[PDB]
């Protein structure tokens, strides 16, 4: 239609949702984790889903804003349990000069506790955006935020990246726990695995839609999983990680 038209309207009437999938711990660990999805609510009141509209709206140069309805909003839920939120950022918010500034002051406003917030990069725009994806990670830390690389392992050389930025969890492209009867798919991800802990990264494995997989992830040694085999993203964070 005009997605553009409508998104624009969207970001000044609360016209999205926030949907919140857990992460869970394998190894002890009492944070309530969950990852926050963004829904688009059209004129109807129907989700939307990112892929119609997050790359038109970066198009259009409403990605940044787009981001700091997220943000903003995760910081006020989470404001109402050890709940920690991972949070996604567009390449537009990368090289958004703007982005801590304005993060650094929304914070303190809504009194959030240190290690609140994990921001979420892709490891393309990590990649493409080198420069200001360690400026923006270091940035973070500085406010006591933590950061991840998310659809890790694609790249050709995808530990180079981690040289540069601070990040403390590392999540894996869902690609690697297809085919996982195939004994070379188990040992691509157990070496993958290996090597982040390696380097004192905090793994995150997703796409666990069996327990075959559930249990070979955790046999692998992974840190924390996530997928609809434990639950699906919600309107409600109420899932039980006792
Ligand atoms: N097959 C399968 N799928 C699963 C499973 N568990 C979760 N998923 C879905 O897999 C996608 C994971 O997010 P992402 O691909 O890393 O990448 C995200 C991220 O790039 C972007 N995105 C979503 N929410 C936000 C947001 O708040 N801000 C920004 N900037 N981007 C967002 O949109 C992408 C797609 O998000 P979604 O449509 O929510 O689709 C999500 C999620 O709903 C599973 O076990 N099996």
């Not at 660990?29 to 609510?41: A, I, K, P, Q, T």
């Amino acid at each position: 239609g005009d997605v553009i038209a409508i998104l624009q309207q969207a970001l000044e009437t609360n016209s999205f949702r926030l949907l919140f999938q857990p992460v869970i711990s394998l190894r002890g660990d009492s944070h309530e984790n969950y990852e926050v999805l963004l829904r688009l609510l059209n004129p109807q009141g129907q989700e939307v889903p990112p892929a119609e509209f997050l790359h038109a709206a970066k198009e259009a140069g409403l990605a940044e804003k787009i981001d700091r309805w997220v943000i903003l909003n995760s910081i006020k839920l989470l404001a109402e349990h050890q709940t920690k939120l991972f949070v996604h950022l567009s390449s537009a918010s990368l090289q958004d000069p703007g982005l801590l500034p304005w993060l650094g002051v929304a914070l303190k406003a809504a009194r959030l506790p240190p290690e609140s917030l994990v921001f979420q990069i892709s490891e393309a725009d990590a990649t493409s955006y080198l420069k200001q994806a360690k400026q923006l990670t270091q940035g973070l830390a500085t406010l006591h935020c933590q950061a991840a690389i998310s659809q890790f392992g694609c790249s050709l050389n995808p530990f180079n990246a981690l040289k540069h930025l601070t990040v403390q969890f590392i999540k894996i492209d869902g690609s690697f726990v297809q085919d996982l009867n195939q004994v070379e798919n188990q040992e691509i991800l157990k070496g993958l695995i290996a090597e982040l802990h390696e380097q004192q990264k905090l793994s995150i494995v997703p796409f666990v839609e069996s327990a075959s997989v559930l249990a070979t992830l955790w046999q692998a040694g992974a840190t924390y999983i996530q997928g609809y085999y434990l639950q699906g993203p919600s309107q409600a964070m109420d899932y039980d990680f006792s």
